[PDB]
Amino acid sequence: AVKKFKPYTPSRRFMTVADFSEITKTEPEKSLVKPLKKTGGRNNQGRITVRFRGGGHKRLYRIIDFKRWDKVGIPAKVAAIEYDPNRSARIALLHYVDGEKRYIIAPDGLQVGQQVVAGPDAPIQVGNALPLRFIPVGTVVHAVELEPKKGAKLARAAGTSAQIQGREGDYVILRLPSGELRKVHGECYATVGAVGNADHKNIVLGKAGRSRWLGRRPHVRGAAMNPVDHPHGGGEGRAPRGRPPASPWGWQTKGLKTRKRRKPSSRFIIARRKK
Amino acid sequence: MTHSMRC
Amino acid sequence: MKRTWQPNRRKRAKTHGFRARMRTPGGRKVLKRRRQKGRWRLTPAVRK
RNA sequence: CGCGGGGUGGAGCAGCCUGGUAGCUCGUCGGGCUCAUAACCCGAAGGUCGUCGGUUCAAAUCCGGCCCCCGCAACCA
RNA sequence: CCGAGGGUAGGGCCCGUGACUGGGGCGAAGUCGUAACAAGGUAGCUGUACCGGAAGGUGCGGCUGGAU
RNA sequence: CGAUGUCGGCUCGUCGCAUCCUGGGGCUGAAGAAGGUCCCAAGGGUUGGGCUGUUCGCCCAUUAAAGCGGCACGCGAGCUG
RNA sequence: GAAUGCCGGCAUGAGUAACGAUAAAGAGGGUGAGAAUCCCUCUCGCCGUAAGCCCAAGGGUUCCUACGCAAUGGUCGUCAGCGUAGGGUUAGGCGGGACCUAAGGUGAAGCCGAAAGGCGUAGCCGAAGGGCAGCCGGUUAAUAUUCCGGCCCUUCCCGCAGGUGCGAUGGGGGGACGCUCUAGGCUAGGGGGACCGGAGCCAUGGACGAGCCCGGCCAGAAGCGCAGGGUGGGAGGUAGGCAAAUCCGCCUCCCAACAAGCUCUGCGUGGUGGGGAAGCCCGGGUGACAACCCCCCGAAGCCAGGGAGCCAAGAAAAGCCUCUAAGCACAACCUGCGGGAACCCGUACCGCAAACCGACACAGGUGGGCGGGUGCAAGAGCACUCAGGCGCGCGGGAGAACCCUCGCCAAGGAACUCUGCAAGUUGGCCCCGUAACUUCGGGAGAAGGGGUGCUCCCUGGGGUGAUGAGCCCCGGGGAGCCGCAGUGAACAGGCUCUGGCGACUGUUUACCAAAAACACAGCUCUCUGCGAACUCGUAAGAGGAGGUAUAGGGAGCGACGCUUGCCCGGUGCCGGAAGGUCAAGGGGAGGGGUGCAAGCCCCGAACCGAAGCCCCGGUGAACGGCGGCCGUAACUAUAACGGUCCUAAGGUAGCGAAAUUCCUUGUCGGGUAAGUUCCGACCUGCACGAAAAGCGUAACGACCGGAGCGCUGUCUCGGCGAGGGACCCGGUGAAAUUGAACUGGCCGUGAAGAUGCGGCCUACCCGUGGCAGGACGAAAAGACCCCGUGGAGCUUUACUGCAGCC
RNA sequence: GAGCUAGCCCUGGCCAGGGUGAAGCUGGGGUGAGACCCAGUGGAGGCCCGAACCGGUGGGGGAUGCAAACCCCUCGGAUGA
RNA sequence: UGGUUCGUGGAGCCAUGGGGGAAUCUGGGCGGACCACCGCCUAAGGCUAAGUACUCCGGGUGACCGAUAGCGCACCAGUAC
Ligand SMILES: [K+]
Ligand SMILES: [Mg+2]
Ligand SMILES: [Mg+2]
Ligand SMILES: [Mg+2]
Ligand SMILES: [Mg+2]
Ligand SMILES: [Mg+2]
Ligand SMILES: [Mg+2]
Ligand SMILES: [Mg+2]
Ligand SMILES: [Mg+2]
Ligand SMILES: [Mg+2]
Ligand SMILES: [Mg+2]
Ligand SMILES: [Mg+2]
Ligand SMILES: [Mg+2]
Ligand SMILES: [Mg+2]
Ligand SMILES: [Mg+2]
Ligand SMILES: [Mg+2]
Ligand SMILES: [Mg+2]
Ligand SMILES: [Mg+2]
Ligand SMILES: [Mg+2]
Ligand SMILES: [Mg+2]
Ligand SMILES: [Mg+2]
Ligand SMILES: [Mg+2]
Ligand SMILES: [Mg+2]
Ligand SMILES: [Mg+2]
Ligand SMILES: [Mg+2]
Ligand SMILES: [Mg+2]
Ligand SMILES: [Mg+2]
Ligand SMILES: [Mg+2]
Ligand SMILES: [Mg+2]
Ligand SMILES: [Mg+2]
Ligand SMILES: [Mg+2]
Ligand SMILES: [Mg+2]
Ligand SMILES: [Mg+2]
Ligand SMILES: [Mg+2]
Ligand SMILES: [Mg+2]
Ligand SMILES: [Mg+2]
Ligand SMILES: [Mg+2]
Ligand SMILES: [Mg+2]
Ligand SMILES: [Mg+2]
Ligand SMILES: [Mg+2]
Ligand SMILES: [Mg+2]
Ligand SMILES: [Mg+2]
Ligand SMILES: [Mg+2]
Ligand SMILES: [Mg+2]
Ligand SMILES: [Mg+2]
Ligand SMILES: [Mg+2]
Ligand SMILES: [Mg+2]
Ligand SMILES: [Mg+2]
Ligand SMILES: [Mg+2]
Ligand SMILES: [Mg+2]
Ligand SMILES: [Mg+2]
Ligand SMILES: [Mg+2]
Ligand SMILES: [Mg+2]
Ligand SMILES: [Mg+2]
Ligand SMILES: [Mg+2]
Ligand SMILES: [Mg+2]
Ligand SMILES: [Mg+2]
Ligand SMILES: [Mg+2]
Ligand SMILES: [Mg+2]
Ligand SMILES: [Mg+2]
Ligand SMILES: [Mg+2]
Ligand SMILES: [Mg+2]
Ligand SMILES: [Mg+2]
Ligand SMILES: [Mg+2]
Ligand SMILES: [Mg+2]
Ligand SMILES: [Mg+2]
Ligand SMILES: [Mg+2]
Ligand SMILES: [Mg+2]
Ligand SMILES: [Mg+2]
Ligand SMILES: [Mg+2]
Ligand SMILES: [Mg+2]
Ligand SMILES: [Mg+2]
Ligand SMILES: [Mg+2]
Ligand SMILES: [Mg+2]
Ligand SMILES: [Mg+2]
Ligand SMILES: [Mg+2]
Ligand SMILES: [Mg+2]
Ligand SMILES: [Mg+2]
Ligand SMILES: [Mg+2]
Ligand SMILES: [Mg+2]
Ligand SMILES: [Mg+2]
Ligand SMILES: [Mg+2]
Ligand SMILES: [Mg+2]
Ligand SMILES: [Mg+2]
Ligand SMILES: [Mg+2]
Ligand SMILES: [Mg+2]
Ligand SMILES: [Mg+2]
Ligand SMILES: [Mg+2]
Ligand SMILES: [Mg+2]
Ligand SMILES: [Mg+2]
Ligand SMILES: [Mg+2]
Ligand SMILES: [Mg+2]
Ligand SMILES: [Mg+2]
Ligand SMILES: [Mg+2]
Ligand SMILES: [Mg+2]
Ligand SMILES: [Mg+2]
Ligand SMILES: [Mg+2]
Ligand SMILES: [Mg+2]
Ligand SMILES: [Mg+2]
Ligand SMILES: [Mg+2]
Ligand SMILES: [Mg+2]
Ligand SMILES: [Mg+2]
Ligand SMILES: [Mg+2]
Ligand SMILES: [Mg+2]
Ligand SMILES: [Mg+2]
Ligand SMILES: [Mg+2]
Ligand SMILES: [Mg+2]
Ligand SMILES: [Mg+2]
Ligand SMILES: [Mg+2]
Ligand SMILES: [Mg+2]
Ligand SMILES: [Mg+2]
Ligand SMILES: [Mg+2]
Ligand SMILES: [Mg+2]
Ligand SMILES: [Mg+2]
Ligand SMILES: [Mg+2]
Ligand SMILES: [Mg+2]
Ligand SMILES: [Mg+2]
Ligand SMILES: [Mg+2]
Ligand SMILES: [Mg+2]
Ligand SMILES: [Mg+2]
Ligand SMILES: [Mg+2]
Ligand SMILES: [Mg+2]
Ligand SMILES: [Mg+2]
Ligand SMILES: [Mg+2]
Ligand SMILES: [Mg+2]
Ligand SMILES: [Mg+2]
Ligand SMILES: [Mg+2]
Ligand SMILES: [Mg+2]
Ligand SMILES: [Mg+2]
Ligand SMILES: [Mg+2]
Ligand SMILES: [Mg+2]
Ligand SMILES: [Mg+2]
Ligand SMILES: [Mg+2]
Ligand SMILES: [Mg+2]
Ligand SMILES: [Mg+2]
Ligand SMILES: [Mg+2]
Ligand SMILES: [Mg+2]
Ligand SMILES: [Mg+2]
Ligand SMILES: [Mg+2]
Ligand SMILES: [Mg+2]
Ligand SMILES: [Mg+2]
Ligand SMILES: [Mg+2]
Ligand SMILES: [Mg+2]
Ligand SMILES: [Mg+2]
Ligand SMILES: [Mg+2]
Ligand SMILES: [Mg+2]
Ligand SMILES: [Mg+2]
Ligand SMILES: [Mg+2]
Ligand SMILES: [Mg+2]
Ligand SMILES: [Mg+2]
Ligand SMILES: [Mg+2]
Ligand SMILES: [Mg+2]
Ligand SMILES: [Mg+2]
Ligand SMILES: [Mg+2]
Ligand SMILES: [Mg+2]
Ligand SMILES: [Mg+2]
Ligand SMILES: [Mg+2]
Ligand SMILES: [Mg+2]
Ligand SMILES: [Mg+2]
Ligand SMILES: [Mg+2]
Ligand SMILES: [Mg+2]
Ligand SMILES: [Mg+2]
Ligand SMILES: [Mg+2]
Ligand SMILES: [Mg+2]
Ligand SMILES: [Mg+2]
Ligand SMILES: [Mg+2]
Ligand SMILES: [Mg+2]
Ligand SMILES: [Mg+2]
Ligand SMILES: [Mg+2]
Ligand SMILES: [Mg+2]
Ligand SMILES: [Mg+2]
Ligand SMILES: [Mg+2]
Ligand SMILES: [Mg+2]
Ligand SMILES: [Mg+2]
Ligand SMILES: [Mg+2]
Ligand SMILES: [Mg+2]
Ligand SMILES: [Mg+2]
Ligand SMILES: [Mg+2]
Ligand SMILES: [Mg+2]
Ligand SMILES: [Mg+2]
Ligand SMILES: [Mg+2]
Ligand SMILES: [Mg+2]
Ligand SMILES: [Mg+2]
Ligand SMILES: [Mg+2]
Ligand SMILES: [Mg+2]
Ligand SMILES: [Mg+2]
Ligand SMILES: [Mg+2]
Ligand SMILES: [Mg+2]
Ligand SMILES: [Mg+2]
Ligand SMILES: [Mg+2]
Ligand SMILES: [Mg+2]
Ligand SMILES: [Mg+2]
Ligand SMILES: [Mg+2]
Ligand SMILES: [Mg+2]
Ligand SMILES: [Mg+2]
Ligand SMILES: [Mg+2]
Ligand SMILES: [Mg+2]
Ligand SMILES: [Mg+2]
Ligand SMILES: [Mg+2]
Ligand SMILES: [Mg+2]
Ligand SMILES: [Mg+2]
Ligand SMILES: [Mg+2]
Ligand SMILES: [Mg+2]
Ligand SMILES: [Mg+2]
Ligand SMILES: [Mg+2]
Ligand SMILES: [Mg+2]
Ligand SMILES: [Mg+2]
Ligand SMILES: [Mg+2]
Ligand SMILES: [Mg+2]
Ligand SMILES: [Mg+2]
Ligand SMILES: [Mg+2]
Ligand SMILES: [Mg+2]
Ligand SMILES: [Mg+2]
Ligand SMILES: [Mg+2]
Ligand SMILES: [Mg+2]
Ligand SMILES: [Mg+2]
Ligand SMILES: [Mg+2]
Ligand SMILES: [Mg+2]
Ligand SMILES: [Mg+2]
Ligand SMILES: [Mg+2]
Ligand SMILES: [Mg+2]
Ligand SMILES: [Mg+2]
Ligand SMILES: [Mg+2]
Ligand SMILES: [Mg+2]
Ligand SMILES: [Mg+2]
Ligand SMILES: [Mg+2]
Ligand SMILES: [Mg+2]
Ligand SMILES: [Mg+2]
Ligand SMILES: [Mg+2]
Ligand SMILES: [Mg+2]
Ligand SMILES: [Mg+2]
Ligand SMILES: [Mg+2]
Ligand SMILES: [Mg+2]
Ligand SMILES: [Mg+2]
Ligand SMILES: [Mg+2]
Ligand SMILES: [Mg+2]
Ligand SMILES: [Mg+2]
Ligand SMILES: [Mg+2]
Ligand SMILES: [Mg+2]
Ligand SMILES: [Mg+2]
Ligand SMILES: [Mg+2]
Ligand SMILES: [Mg+2]
Ligand SMILES: [Mg+2]
Ligand SMILES: [Mg+2]
Ligand SMILES: [Mg+2]
Ligand SMILES: [Mg+2]
Ligand SMILES: [Mg+2]
Ligand SMILES: [Mg+2]
Ligand SMILES: [Mg+2]
Ligand SMILES: [Mg+2]
Ligand SMILES: [Mg+2]
Ligand SMILES: [Mg+2]
Ligand SMILES: [Mg+2]
Ligand SMILES: [Mg+2]
Ligand SMILES: [Mg+2]
Ligand SMILES: [Mg+2]
Ligand SMILES: [Mg+2]
Ligand SMILES: [Mg+2]
Ligand SMILES: [Mg+2]
Ligand SMILES: [Mg+2]
Ligand SMILES: [Mg+2]
């Protein structure tokens, strides 16, 4: 339930902020944070390779347990749910009966004080992780490994989920957040339920500065530039595109497909996405 | 400045 | 107004200094040429 | 006397390119159906192709002058 | 001191008036189509919505004040 | 074209007369008053505003009259812009 | 003899401009060959959130002293940041290093690249960040947390004593963190005093006073006091912290909890050590056995790792503590004390500037700290002042034009002008009061008004203290006084109505454009399933992202409201296992050369044969595009209606003479005395129109238009006055330019605009202050324009390539 | 060559004073419980006024300059992109 | 594909990035497509003086310069700036 503001400034008219009402702990576990080297979208040559990045708030990275098969069989208690500035989801702090403390992505409806567990035998229960082959068909799942033991790769953004649709030998058929239908190996891990903080998409940044807080520097339209800069540059007065709408680098950007055709994962993509 | 603009 | 020369001793030694020149094929050519020309100084003066 | 396009039955359009053959829809007139009209059905008539002149055996058609009618252009200062 | 009233400034109500504009009523013999009255030739009416020179049409849901 | 700055305004004049006014005349379809037309005449005079960058022009209120043109479309080593 | 030639020398302009902030000078004495300019004194003026003081950069002897004055210094010079010489910088505690890590740099391992080289984990380097032990005073011509004095402290080594499972680059804890707001108690700093100390003073009418003036502290170890920060204890289990662990982490149990205990800071006190004014007399000495106390104000600093709230969620590593491993427990570590040991570099001076960056002793630029007092609501604002520092390195006169900056103005009040440009007005605070419209916040300081000084009297609450006095902070009422005037000086909105554009705060052409441009939240299309797409790179590798479709790239649109129509024929993109065409390759009908021949060699038709293209569809918030002629109504006029031709389809709503309208100052209405602009309309829209978005929209704007009120030197129309120049005298003394010149007017002539030719007219020789008509005046080998088979940026269905992709 | 300038990265620092008064919270009212209303408290914001500081809007001066972009008056931002 | 006079030419020879891939003299390469004949030569390992080039250095000599010339420098010059 996003929070709104009275129009006491021009920007507060529209600004919405997350309600943060699920967060129980407001500074991070000191043994599970590390420095996040800001990049400004510059590579190791020093060149901007992703335009319009930088200048955002300082952040500590929280180390997230994307494996969970690390600790098959060891129940953990949900100790706290916390803010994480490096992702859209919230994160949950597990106190394993081992003594080990780890973070995971906070699925929807997970509660402080409940217990979660990973493994083939885990109860079909929000927060438990299992290999996909043991999750019954139809179950809504998240934090999905894309290849066995390579780490949860799919459905990790706030609100997303993947639905199990069928099985076929060693493989399961998933419907991804995009709506694509894909084979994923049965031994791949996933966590029961959807990612939480589903209201994330309804936030209205409200003012330019709020984008700047996130590290997003202003985006300049190609039509605002000059011919040396961009296909859409130049012209007297305003100007329509005057050619198929293009990127700065000249490739077409309205419909031109860019997935590599001869890609091996094609044998596993059943249906391309939707909408 | 420059020149008188005789244009 | 603020002009272009803003002296900085660390900057001078780290940009034009002997060890900067020596680390790069272009820098070693600079010293080679300046020796052959007989320059009294191979590298700019900076007090450190 | 800047550059284009056009003028042909009553209206709007083919036919000109490639000289010999005027055509299509509506309209107009005579009949029919209807109590009557319209629609509909059956017939028919009307154009010497803006104009003058030339080429040719033969000109709406090809060439030159004139008349008329739309369209474009008129920049550097 | 109060004080008729005069002055400055800002409001509220009402009346008249205005290029132009909206639809309304009326007007013996205008132009277009034929929506409704018979099952009116697509039953009609209806709230709403969208569309169309015009009546109207169509969708959704509702009424019989609908015929056989 | 190894540069003769280009509109208008403001300022400052000066000249021509094919004269707008003022002075002198003739003719009149000149009764008077007022006009018309032509001749002589450049001494002096020839207003303030609204609009537009404007020149010009139209409008307002006057006036004896609200002249027309030349001076590198007079005048940017005088100003404006 | 010319090349706007090259190098140099010297002219002209010219004794001309200028001599660098309008903060300002005068006189006496001294020194000296020489004095407005150096030294001393008195007067005067200027800065005083600095124009004073302290750090850091940078500079590099500029510091101090003696002797100098050729040059440097915009004049002068005896002076100097100048010349010559001598002197001067003292650290275990300040800063940096023998400590730590950050971005980044480097880089054993490893990876990549024709070479050169590019990467790269750990590790190393890397600071103004973390860490770490010195305060006050005295002294030198010049250094001082450095020397000296007093009182403190740190590390290393060795010894003694007591204690202990000792031991680490390993495990863990800690270090360790944002923004805003902010409590309690203190310190810094400051105000006052009728109390304490002091050389004195009584003037000019008065005052010998509860008078004036000056001062009334600083540091300090343990201890103690105040205020704070940090911190649970014990036991059992234990599989996690990449070995081990008695540590930490998790579970259970008992006790303790707004405490306390232990510990760590800050402030106070504290043995002791210091300092100590005016005035006076020649930096000193005296004052002086100086006193050193009370009240108030009070931080943004301190306690600090404090508290609360919020979202954008806020370094590392070491020092330190704790745990154990090898090892070792004759060791080793901890605690206490003692002696010994303690290295390298900086340290002068300038430092908002005459010593730094600007070629200059240049009105510019330069990070951090302190920055007193009074009054004005507050304040670092403003005025005046303290401490301290200056009068800006040419002067003296005169009192023209003209220029600058400034003051005032009768009557009028925008008549000025492209434009109220400029300048008036308005101006703070308190109170009264305030409209359309609105997204309910606002619009708003709307507008418009009233109040403002001083004296006496009465009185309400707070802070400190004690509840009182005193000091201090907020008020309320009553009665009076003076002036032209009470935010009495200084600082300090003019307002309203109505359009266009852009939602808004922001951003931009460093140095002619700040805008309607860019950006912006938000909207839509599209790509991307993760070794993502995309981007940089030959590659490795990076970014994307330690992110994962509620995510990331690309494009357009641009808050928000209401909306966004028709065309897929061409181009694009998307889909299409057929068909057509299509390269290398396969295949080898059939030929050719040569040889005696086995053979060798060459050409080669059918046929198989990808992407692309064609072909079949889709697709508009993809590129784009959205008609013509003729006729028609019972007055006229105009056509709801019809006919026909064309197209892929003929522009919908909304808006419209518009940032778009050529004809145009369209037409009518409003406003004005008068309105090519403005506003409202109409619609034959030359040539609006729906995300190159269409129409609106509260609020916002150093945007652009139109109007009104207020007020004005803008103007009628100009006048006077101030100061800095201009002028004159002394000092110093440029410049562009310059074929040479003994350089007049008219009317002609001339390459067509003549000081220079002709004819006439006019004119003694030479300057000074002024004005700009001419010398086709100066400056710059015209930017416009053209020309050159000159150049460069840019574009595309120009040509031809290459990357990239298939 | 990024000691100028543009962007980003790391680590520090700075922003006098005044004004407005959001959410929340407490209390009161309200209702079946709510919504919600009033007061108090509270201290939000690319909020308001205004120094430092960052700018460069209009005009004037300067134009062989004090300056190869300055000076004066005025004006924009000043807790934030 | 490079090299050569050879720019695809009738294009051999020498070299080689890709694919296929021998034999040891009765083997193999060449004589400008190719074949025959006739001749030349021995690939896929290495080394090798001298004659050749240059002038920082030293000396000798000029129908070379003679201080704006000759080296940028006759001199405290790759300096001052
Ligand atoms: K041109
Ligand atoms: Mg809101
Ligand atoms: Mg609201
Ligand atoms: Mg939450
Ligand atoms: Mg850590
Ligand atoms: Mg990175
Ligand atoms: Mg790197
Ligand atoms: Mg990018
Ligand atoms: Mg970037
Ligand atoms: Mg989160
Ligand atoms: Mg994310
Ligand atoms: Mg898989
Ligand atoms: Mg959004
Ligand atoms: Mg951020
Ligand atoms: Mg964005
Ligand atoms: Mg943009
Ligand atoms: Mg552009
Ligand atoms: Mg542009
Ligand atoms: Mg470029
Ligand atoms: Mg290009
Ligand atoms: Mg391009
Ligand atoms: Mg374009
Ligand atoms: Mg453009
Ligand atoms: Mg255009
Ligand atoms: Mg443009
Ligand atoms: Mg186009
Ligand atoms: Mg394109
Ligand atoms: Mg691509
Ligand atoms: Mg898909
Ligand atoms: Mg600069
Ligand atoms: Mg700098
Ligand atoms: Mg330095
Ligand atoms: Mg430095
Ligand atoms: Mg540096
Ligand atoms: Mg470097
Ligand atoms: Mg170096
Ligand atoms: Mg090399
Ligand atoms: Mg040198
Ligand atoms: Mg030497
Ligand atoms: Mg060098
Ligand atoms: Mg016809
Ligand atoms: Mg034809
Ligand atoms: Mg024919
Ligand atoms: Mg016919
Ligand atoms: Mg008939
Ligand atoms: Mg009939
Ligand atoms: Mg015929
Ligand atoms: Mg009266
Ligand atoms: Mg009729
Ligand atoms: Mg019906
Ligand atoms: Mg009917
Ligand atoms: Mg019916
Ligand atoms: Mg019908
Ligand atoms: Mg329909
Ligand atoms: Mg010319
Ligand atoms: Mg010349
Ligand atoms: Mg010239
Ligand atoms: Mg005038
Ligand atoms: Mg008469
Ligand atoms: Mg006459
Ligand atoms: Mg006259
Ligand atoms: Mg006019
Ligand atoms: Mg006109
Ligand atoms: Mg008269
Ligand atoms: Mg004239
Ligand atoms: Mg003319
Ligand atoms: Mg003219
Ligand atoms: Mg002309
Ligand atoms: Mg002129
Ligand atoms: Mg001029
Ligand atoms: Mg002019
Ligand atoms: Mg001139
Ligand atoms: Mg001239
Ligand atoms: Mg102009
Ligand atoms: Mg000659
Ligand atoms: Mg010259
Ligand atoms: Mg030359
Ligand atoms: Mg020369
Ligand atoms: Mg000489
Ligand atoms: Mg010379
Ligand atoms: Mg000379
Ligand atoms: Mg001479
Ligand atoms: Mg002279
Ligand atoms: Mg002179
Ligand atoms: Mg001068
Ligand atoms: Mg000067
Ligand atoms: Mg000044
Ligand atoms: Mg002044
Ligand atoms: Mg002053
Ligand atoms: Mg004097
Ligand atoms: Mg002197
Ligand atoms: Mg002297
Ligand atoms: Mg002086
Ligand atoms: Mg003196
Ligand atoms: Mg005196
Ligand atoms: Mg120096
Ligand atoms: Mg001297
Ligand atoms: Mg001298
Ligand atoms: Mg001497
Ligand atoms: Mg000198
Ligand atoms: Mg000077
Ligand atoms: Mg002397
Ligand atoms: Mg010294
Ligand atoms: Mg010491
Ligand atoms: Mg050592
Ligand atoms: Mg290190
Ligand atoms: Mg390479
Ligand atoms: Mg380093
Ligand atoms: Mg350090
Ligand atoms: Mg830190
Ligand atoms: Mg100490
Ligand atoms: Mg001291
Ligand atoms: Mg112990
Ligand atoms: Mg921490
Ligand atoms: Mg941390
Ligand atoms: Mg203290
Ligand atoms: Mg005080
Ligand atoms: Mg003393
Ligand atoms: Mg004594
Ligand atoms: Mg502070
Ligand atoms: Mg602190
Ligand atoms: Mg805190
Ligand atoms: Mg926040
Ligand atoms: Mg690190
Ligand atoms: Mg052992
Ligand atoms: Mg032993
Ligand atoms: Mg050592
Ligand atoms: Mg020192
Ligand atoms: Mg300054
Ligand atoms: Mg100085
Ligand atoms: Mg310079
Ligand atoms: Mg000076
Ligand atoms: Mg004081
Ligand atoms: Mg005040
Ligand atoms: Mg002075
Ligand atoms: Mg000064
Ligand atoms: Mg005089
Ligand atoms: Mg007066
Ligand atoms: Mg007056
Ligand atoms: Mg008036
Ligand atoms: Mg008035
Ligand atoms: Mg006016
Ligand atoms: Mg203007
Ligand atoms: Mg005023
Ligand atoms: Mg005032
Ligand atoms: Mg109101
Ligand atoms: Mg109103
Ligand atoms: Mg209003
Ligand atoms: Mg409004
Ligand atoms: Mg309201
Ligand atoms: Mg007011
Ligand atoms: Mg108010
Ligand atoms: Mg009063
Ligand atoms: Mg008084
Ligand atoms: Mg009085
Ligand atoms: Mg104001
Ligand atoms: Mg804007
Ligand atoms: Mg804009
Ligand atoms: Mg707009
Ligand atoms: Mg808007
Ligand atoms: Mg702002
Ligand atoms: Mg500019
Ligand atoms: Mg420019
Ligand atoms: Mg420039
Ligand atoms: Mg400007
Ligand atoms: Mg502009
Ligand atoms: Mg602006
Ligand atoms: Mg822009
Ligand atoms: Mg915007
Ligand atoms: Mg969307
Ligand atoms: Mg690339
Ligand atoms: Mg990463
Ligand atoms: Mg929008
Ligand atoms: Mg934009
Ligand atoms: Mg609305
Ligand atoms: Mg529509
Ligand atoms: Mg299609
Ligand atoms: Mg289409
Ligand atoms: Mg298409
Ligand atoms: Mg194919
Ligand atoms: Mg098209
Ligand atoms: Mg087009
Ligand atoms: Mg119109
Ligand atoms: Mg419009
Ligand atoms: Mg238009
Ligand atoms: Mg017009
Ligand atoms: Mg016009
Ligand atoms: Mg008009
Ligand atoms: Mg009117
Ligand atoms: Mg209008
Ligand atoms: Mg019309
Ligand atoms: Mg477009
Ligand atoms: Mg447009
Ligand atoms: Mg509009
Ligand atoms: Mg609006
Ligand atoms: Mg508005
Ligand atoms: Mg604005
Ligand atoms: Mg603006
Ligand atoms: Mg105006
Ligand atoms: Mg006005
Ligand atoms: Mg005047
Ligand atoms: Mg004067
Ligand atoms: Mg004289
Ligand atoms: Mg002299
Ligand atoms: Mg001199
Ligand atoms: Mg001569
Ligand atoms: Mg002569
Ligand atoms: Mg003469
Ligand atoms: Mg003469
Ligand atoms: Mg002529
Ligand atoms: Mg002449
Ligand atoms: Mg003459
Ligand atoms: Mg002569
Ligand atoms: Mg002659
Ligand atoms: Mg003559
Ligand atoms: Mg003569
Ligand atoms: Mg004469
Ligand atoms: Mg003179
Ligand atoms: Mg003169
Ligand atoms: Mg002249
Ligand atoms: Mg002149
Ligand atoms: Mg002249
Ligand atoms: Mg000339
Ligand atoms: Mg001239
Ligand atoms: Mg020039
Ligand atoms: Mg040239
Ligand atoms: Mg030329
Ligand atoms: Mg030129
Ligand atoms: Mg030309
Ligand atoms: Mg050519
Ligand atoms: Mg040619
Ligand atoms: Mg060319
Ligand atoms: Mg820089
Ligand atoms: Mg601030
Ligand atoms: Mg309040
Ligand atoms: Mg609260
Ligand atoms: Mg603000
Ligand atoms: Mg305000
Ligand atoms: Mg600036
Ligand atoms: Mg002004
Ligand atoms: Mg200039
Ligand atoms: Mg000012
Ligand atoms: Mg502020
Ligand atoms: Mg402000
Ligand atoms: Mg910020
Ligand atoms: Mg070759
Ligand atoms: Mg060959
Ligand atoms: Mg053989
Ligand atoms: Mg053989
Ligand atoms: Mg061979
Ligand atoms: Mg051979
Ligand atoms: Mg051979
Ligand atoms: Mg051999
Ligand atoms: Mg000789
Ligand atoms: Mg010489
Ligand atoms: Mg020489
Ligand atoms: Mg010579
Ligand atoms: Mg030599
Ligand atoms: Mg030599
Ligand atoms: Mg030389
Ligand atoms: Mg030398």
From Swiss-Prot, chain A:
Matches recorded under HAMAP family: Ribosomal_uL2_B
Region: Disordered, residue numbers: 222-275
Amino acid composition bias (Basic residues), ranges on this chain: 256-275
Function summary: One of the primary rRNA binding proteins. Required for association of the 30S and 50S subunits to form the 70S ribosome, for tRNA binding and peptide bond formation. It has been suggested to have peptidyltransferase activity; this is somewhat controversial. Makes several contacts with the 16S rRNA (forming bridge B7b) in the 70S ribosome.
Name of the encoding gene: rplB
Biased composition annotated in UniProt, kind: Basic and acidic residues: 229-239
Family statement drawn from the similarity comment of this UniProt entry: Belongs to the universal ribosomal protein uL2 family.
GO terms, biological process: cytoplasmic translation
Identification of the protein by name: Large ribosomal subunit protein uL2
Recorded GO MF terms: rRNA binding; structural constituent of ribosome; transferase activity
Domain of life from the UniProt record: Bacteria
Matching SMART domains: Ribosomal_L2, Ribosomal_L2_C
Pfam families (UniProt xref): Ribosomal_L2 (PF00181), Ribosomal_L2_C (PF03947)
Annotated Gene Ontology cellular component terms: large ribosomal subunit
PANTHER family membership: LARGE RIBOSOMAL SUBUNIT PROTEIN UL2M, RIBOSOMAL PROTEIN L2
Keyword Cytoplasm: no
Assigned keywords, A-Z: Ribonucleoprotein, Ribosomal protein, RNA-binding, rRNA-binding
From Swiss-Prot, chain C:
GO CC annotation terms, alphabetical: ribonucleoprotein complex; ribosome
Family that this chain belongs to: Belongs to the bacterial ribosomal protein bL34 family.
Keyword field: Ribonucleoprotein, Ribosomal protein
Function: Found on the solvent side of the large subunit.
Ribosomal protein keyword on record: yes
Entry protein name: Large ribosomal subunit protein bL34
One Pfam family cited in the UniProt record for this chain: Ribosomal_L34
GO function terms (MF aspect): structural constituent of ribosome
One Gene Ontology term from the biological process aspect of the record: translation
Region (Disordered): 26-48
Ribosomal protein recorded as keyword: yes
Binding partners and assembly: Part of the 50S ribosomal subunit.
Basic residues biased stretches: 29-48
Organism, as annotated: Thermus thermophilus (strain ATCC 27634 / DSM 579 / HB8)
Miscellaneous section: The open reading frame (ORF) for this protein is entirely within the ORF for the RNase P protein (RnaP). The two start codons are separated by four nucleotides.
